[PDB]
Amino acid sequence: TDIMRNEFERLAARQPIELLSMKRYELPECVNNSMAQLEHQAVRIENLELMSQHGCNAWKVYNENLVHMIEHAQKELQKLRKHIQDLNWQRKN
Amino acid sequence: MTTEAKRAAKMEKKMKILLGGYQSRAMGLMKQLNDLWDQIEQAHLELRTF
Amino acid sequence: LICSISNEVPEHPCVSPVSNHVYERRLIEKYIAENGTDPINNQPLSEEQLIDIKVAHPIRPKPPSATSIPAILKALQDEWDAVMLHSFTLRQQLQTTRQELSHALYQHDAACRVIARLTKEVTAAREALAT
Amino acid sequence: LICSISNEVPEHPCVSPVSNHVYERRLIEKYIAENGTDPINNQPLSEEQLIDIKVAHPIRPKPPSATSIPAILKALQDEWDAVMLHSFTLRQQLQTTRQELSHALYQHDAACRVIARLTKEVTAAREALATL
Amino acid sequence: LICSISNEVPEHPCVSPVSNHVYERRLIEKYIAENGTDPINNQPLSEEQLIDIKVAHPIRPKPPSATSIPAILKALQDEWDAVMLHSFTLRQQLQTTRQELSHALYQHDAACRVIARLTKEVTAAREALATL
Amino acid sequence: LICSISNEVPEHPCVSPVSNHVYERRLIEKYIAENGTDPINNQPLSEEQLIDIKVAHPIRPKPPSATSIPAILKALQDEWDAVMLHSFTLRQQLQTTRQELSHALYQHDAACRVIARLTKEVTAAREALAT
Questions:
Q1: Nearest Cα residue to F71 out of A21, A25, A12, A15
Q2: Taking the CA of residue C75 as centre, how many other CA atoms within 13 Å lie in the half-sphere pointing to its CB?
């Protein structure tokens, strides 16, 4: 129950063929392809500078968030565990 | 091309050993969610069945 | 923390006032235009009825080997592979649930007839001992 | 592509810098000379406050192109937006059917134990009455 | 990850449906029992209006990563929107260099006519004086 | 119609009050976060100074065509490939217009040294004519 999306998706899976993305960016008409590699390499080297500036502080700050997210799930595992055993406990009598 | 390629790739493995612990840490956490979110949903069965 | 439609981690979460559930704005906006009601509770809901929520924002660390090249080629390819082979496999899971439904209800009704057949059998065997 | 005073297609789209909602230069200028105000918000506005004329400079014109680039990513988002909406409704029915499967299988083998009990009692009634 | 009222890591998060900003159930419950209001916006809120955080429904999610298609598309916006500002740094600096070149070549074109006349006049004064 | 920073059609435009210029909300914020100024007039401006302008009507979606989707992958590849060279060509031209400007400044100041010797040859001539 979807639009055009479903027709090309089911056709891609049935045929067993992924749609090719041509971004000759890597190889380099080649005067353009060459000039593409420079600007993205400069953007790359600027994109690696702002990461290294913070470095591991930005990563371990997100690692702490993932531990707050995890413990909340296992608290609900217990709350379900208790009420599940509590219902069975009433049935037993 | 090749200079900035050799720059960014060496810049990558500057980070890829730095983040690569945290990459492997986050993968170990993301598995542990996907371990639980079956048992979260498996518990969601065995409420309403029971 | 997640959206209650796609299974996302929303960038602009918005809560509906008829049923307290956080959706990502684009996906809830699309549902209201398709059919103006809340997706979960099936209650009357409009675009003006929604309330945008605020949080400390979500951060994704763009990988160390991040360029226009892998993002165009390798990463985007994997995303439409992972969408394709999952929903196809999910359509396979829905088909078997309906088949395994039919084996459940038939075996259930088969058991009902055994009980009804044995309910006439037992009490008349007990009655014969009384006689 | 519409002015917010008359409703005409603006040939010189100027905007007010208090509550911009693109007007046409002729109509907004006649509103300002009538009374120095913005027509929509009734805030203070003058003729010099208005930003007139088209903007393209040091930009190069790309008429909303079919084989461009930025809208291809927008289109990639729009098709994914459906992918998520489809996966949700498919999963709801997946788990909601599993509840019927689970409740049935449990209640089936539960109702199955009714027979095991019933059969052995029925059997006891036979030898009892037979031997009597 | 945090509760906005206390500042702790909430062990039972419940999101409000008026001024949502994930609150801890035990903290927000007492805030509602004090007065039926949301602590941030001071809009009316009851305990039934508050809603616990839940797994969406039946569609399975995965954590927010660089692979994920939507996160990859918002990445390519950052790429282009930053590169668009890189073009302004060179368009604006070009308008200063060409403006200084225009005034430089004009001062060169205004001066070299005076070098041509002095080379005429100093040689004409040597042609005149030497003959006498 | 055009934000005067990127060249896009703005999807949430905001106008600066120090200088009449409709910018895009994302781009003007990054500039203010770098340095509290306006990019055109260099006047002291802040984030609270900005007034979000409303443009509901102009929004017009591009419907590329029925166009095959695997081809739309290679279009976005080519368009990023083109913009990378359209940004490169515009920067080397800025460096050479400044470079050729610096060659004019040397000739400008070298010429006004050569006029001083030519004025002396005229001054020496006016003394000899008098005698």
A1: A21
A2: 21
Chain A's closest residue to F72, CA to CA, is A21
Between the two ends of chain A, the Cα-to-Cα distance in Å is 49
Query: Token match 């084989």: residue?
Result: D67
Resolution in angstroms comes to 3.3
Provide the domain count of chain D.
1
SS3 category, F22:
strand
CA dihedral E116, E120, E122, E128 (to 10 degrees): 180
* Closest chain C residue to D107, measured at CA: C108
Q: What string of DSSP letters covers D57-84? A: SSS----S-SS-SHHHHHHHHHHHHHHH
Distance CA C41, CA C20 (A): 10
C74: domain range?
Answer: 1-131
For C4, C11, E15, E41, the CA distances from C53, given in Å and listed in that order, are 15, 10, 9, 11
* Cα gap C4→B35, rounded to integer Å: 20
Judge whether D65 and F62 are in contact, CB under 8 Å: yes
Q: How many Cβ atoms from other residues are within 10 Å of residue E45's Cβ?
A: 21
Alpha-carbon span E7 to E20, nearest angstrom:
15
**Paired tokens of E127:** 């042609």
Technique used by the depositors: cryo-EM
Using an 8 Å CB-CB cutoff, list chain D residues near B48: 99, 103
Cα E5 to Cα C11, C22, D103, E10, E53, distances in angstroms: 23, 20, 43, 10, 17
**φ, ψ at D36 (rounded to 5°):** -65, 85
**D57 CA to chain E: closest CA distance, Å?**
10
Distance CA D28, CA D34 (A): 10
Closest CA to A8 of D83, F74, E69: D83
